[PDB]
Amino acid sequence: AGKKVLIVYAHQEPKSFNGSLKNVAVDELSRQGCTVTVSDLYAMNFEPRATDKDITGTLSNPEVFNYGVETHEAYKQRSLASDITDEQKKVREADLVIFQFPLYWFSVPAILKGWMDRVLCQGFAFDIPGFYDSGLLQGKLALLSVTTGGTAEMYTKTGVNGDSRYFLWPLQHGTLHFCGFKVLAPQISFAPEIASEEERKGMVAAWSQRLQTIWKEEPIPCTAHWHFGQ
Amino acid sequence: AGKKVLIVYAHQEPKSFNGSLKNVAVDELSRQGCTVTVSDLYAMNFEPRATDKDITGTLSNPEVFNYGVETHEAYKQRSLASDITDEQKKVREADLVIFQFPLYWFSVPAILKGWMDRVLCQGFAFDIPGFYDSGLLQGKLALLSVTTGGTAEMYTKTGVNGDSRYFLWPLQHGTLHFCGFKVLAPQISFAPEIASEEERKGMVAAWSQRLQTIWKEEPIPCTAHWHFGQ
Ligand SMILES: Cc1cc2nc3c(=O)[nH]c(=O)nc-3n(C[C@H](O)[C@H](O)[C@H](O)COP(=O)(O)OP(=O)(O)OC[C@H]3O[C@@H](n4cnc5c(N)ncnc54)[C@H](O)[C@@H]3O)c2cc1C
Ligand SMILES: Cc1cc2nc3c(=O)[nH]c(=O)nc-3n(C[C@H](O)[C@H](O)[C@H](O)COP(=O)(O)OP(=O)(O)OC[C@H]3O[C@@H](n4cnc5c(N)ncnc54)[C@H](O)[C@@H]3O)c2cc1C
Ligand SMILES: C=Nc1c(Cl)c(N)c2c3c(cc(C(N)=O)nc13)C(=O)N2C
Ligand SMILES: C=Nc1c(Cl)c(N)c2c3c(cc(C(N)=O)nc13)C(=O)N2C
Ligand SMILES: [Zn+2]
Ligand SMILES: [Zn+2]
């Protein structure tokens, strides 16, 4: 209160552990009196491919298709596909953007990758001045709530997978910071499938409890040192 | 020769710089007598979303959908969608897989993220146990050939983007090495948009030239120390 939150959710199954983390976020933020919107990307059959269909009307150069240039011009001329502009409205209005997803290949599922590719366009999220602290989404907060197959011990600097912070870099720094977001500390729910039930309840409840005081958090220093240093 | 190469290519425009790097690879590897296949993902309209359409038979659990579980079972039973098995045959036969793509948000374009998510399934590319140095694609080589908006100076340890090798981690380590590939050093062609005609022609030629001796190369040590230092 008065704050708006967008949850960008990427799981196919409403009964999943990610579906439960998304639902308790809706439940707890709704309870606080926040304005909440969820983009359920699989239920929306969200298009992930960056293609010339993302521009309506006639292309800026139909000889040689340059996705970046075309979408930048289309944004300035109010000529983006409506699925993209609908997401952009939700982002524009949000004070916090939560991403809820299972880790796929040390990153987001392709459907969520395609949201970041197509929704966060030049002119909207950043300019070619435009970027990192000069990024156009400055003022806004973002938070990654990720679930994994591998265990917390696997995600240590000398475990098989490396530190979890190592995989966060392209998402927190190259994506969210580049657009100007301030980044809250990630919520990482390790290996729910091997946890009990229980520890799974622990995990869901810890996320609900964290969201009680989410507005009181300061963002992380989204630097190479935070991700890789000591 | 004496070798089969699959190039997984992700760019919308045949006249692009990525297009030229993909064609020079086909030209040089063809000239050497190698067998060469190209998966041009935007031309194939390749499906990036991981959904229940990727399984055609009876689901293991039809009331709660688990993508990993159902694709692993479908692989074993031969009930995966045929686009996924078509790609797996190309990978099965390849000695070397080159990914040619523009960097999107410090990672691969979503259409290529979807290829990784859907093609490299459990049972085909890894099993649990059977990952990293015991991954199922052991004995194959992989190479990321990436282009960027950002300059080489931006992609240094003290530059705004961080060192280039930091964004390579989820791809080379979390994906390729997890599946048992040995990873050749990446080809990064920085900032072709800003380079002159001569400097772009130079970058194309440096890749053709590198490919002349590609079979003599050793892989990188795909470790946290190679990516992050210390
Ligand atoms: C393409 C692909 C790539 C992947 N790449 C990686 C990777 O790089 N690194 C990695 O570590 N892992 C990877 N994984 C594994 C993936 O990250 C995990 O499978 C996923 O994070 C598990 O979350 P989920 O919501 O699907 O769990 P679910 O299987 O849905 O949940 C686990 C259990 O929790 C239960 N549950 C649901 N709600 C509740 C609740 N409210 N309270 C208590 N229990 C509950 C469920 O019923 C279920 O029994 C990959 C998976 C795929 C398919
Ligand atoms: C969604 C999105 C996300 C991005 N995220 C990032 C990111 O995180 N970090 C980043 O650094 N960049 C990012 N970029 C920028 C992107 O990586 C670059 O635009 C892309 O790498 C440039 O390659 P290209 O093949 O498209 O260049 P092109 O625009 O096709 O090439 C530049 C020039 O080369 C010319 N050319 C083609 N072939 C030849 C040849 N044989 N000889 C000489 N000239 C030739 C072309 O005609 C053109 O003038 C992003 C872009 C998009 C659209
Ligand atoms: C990396 N790919 C993975 C895929 Cl594709 C997958 N289906 C899976 C995992 C797990 C752990 C790790 C991991 N890296 O710890 N990685 C993966 C896991 O439990 N499952 C079920
Ligand atoms: C990060 N996203 C980017 C987008 Cl989406 C994009 N369209 C673009 C860049 C460039 C550089 C960098 C960068 N990080 O150096 N990042 C990006 C660039 O020249 N173009 C055209
Ligand atoms: Zn940062
Ligand atoms: Zn590795």
Curated annotation (Swiss-Prot), chains A, B:
FAD binds at residues 11, 17-20, 103-106, 147-150, 155, 193, 200. This is Ribosyldihydronicotinamide dehydrogenase [quinone]. Binds 1 zinc ion per subunit. It holds the Pfam family Flavodoxin_2. One of its GO terms (molecular function) is electron transfer activity. The keyword Oxidoreductase applies. It is found in: Cytoplasm. Zn(2+) binds at H173, H177, C222. Its cofactor is Zn(2+); FAD. Inhibited by melatonin, resveratrol and 5-hydroxytryptamine. Belongs to the NAD(P)H dehydrogenase (quinone) family. Its EC number is 1.10.5.1. The gene is NQO2. The modification Phosphoserine is found at S79, S196. InterPro entries: Flavodoxin_fold (IPR003680), Flavoprotein-like_sf (IPR029039), NAD(P)H_dehydrogenase_qn (IPR051545). The lineage of its organism: Eukaryota, Metazoa, Chordata, Craniata, Vertebrata. One of its GO terms (cellular component) is nucleoplasm. Homodimer.
